[PDB]
């Protein structure tokens, strides 16, 4: 009985129902998210991709609630292990496979790193994290093809911490648009 937005365009709009309030109910905008079937002629215009790391590319600004994007992963791209600043997130696949490992917080001592949990997002799944939840990383599977994801941020956010798998330790790193609206921000 999950409501299926026929168009990207038409997931933005319930998106802007389901945030214009106080309360979120995550499972319900997860199954939302899902159930919208990845079209490439809908996103094809945020698809900016860069050689050697992977891009951000805003697709919409939410209204000050949320922070709708595309993530463009080249081939054999990935993400550090970071965390998400207090905010929900969301994230689906648009194209190709992303694995998420999932790690536990670090304490004030040093100690590589612990995986909770390690997946491989199927074709338009979306998944969900927020801080409580853990640490993750995520990459592309493939070294001969890209992988596109669609995420969505509540509350925006622009900045978080990098992790490093050998001892815990973390650096706060900015992050930054590729792209807004389909137009190059350089
Ligand atoms: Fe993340």
Redesign the pocket.
């Known amino acids: 009985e999950v409501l299926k937005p026929r168009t990207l365009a038409d997931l933005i709009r319930i998106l802007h129902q389901l945030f214009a309030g106080d309360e979120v109910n995550v499972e319900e905008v997860q199954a939302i998210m899902e159930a919208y079937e990845s079209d490439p002629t809908e996103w094809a215009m945020y698809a900016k991709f860069d050689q050697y790391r992977y891009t951000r590319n805003l697709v919409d600004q939410g209204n000050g609630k949320f922070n709708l994007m595309i993530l463009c992963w080249g081939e054999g791209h990935g ?1 550090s292990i ?1 965390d ?1 600043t207090n905010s929900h ?1 969301f ?1 689906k696949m648009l194209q190709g496979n992303l694995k998420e490992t999932l790690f536990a917080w670090p304490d004030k001592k040093s100690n590589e790193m612990v995986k909770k949990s390690e997946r491989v997002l199927r074709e338009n799944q979306c998944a969900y ?1 927020n801080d409580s939840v853990g640490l ?1 990383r ?1 990459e592309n599977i493939s070294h001969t093809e890209p992988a596109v994801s669609l995420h969505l941020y509540s509350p925006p956010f622009d900045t978080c911490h990098a992790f490093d798998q050998r001892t815990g330790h973390k650096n706060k790193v900015t992050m930054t648009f590729h792209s807004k609206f389909g137009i190059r921000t350089p």
């Open positions: 993400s970071h998400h997130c994230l994290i993750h995520v």
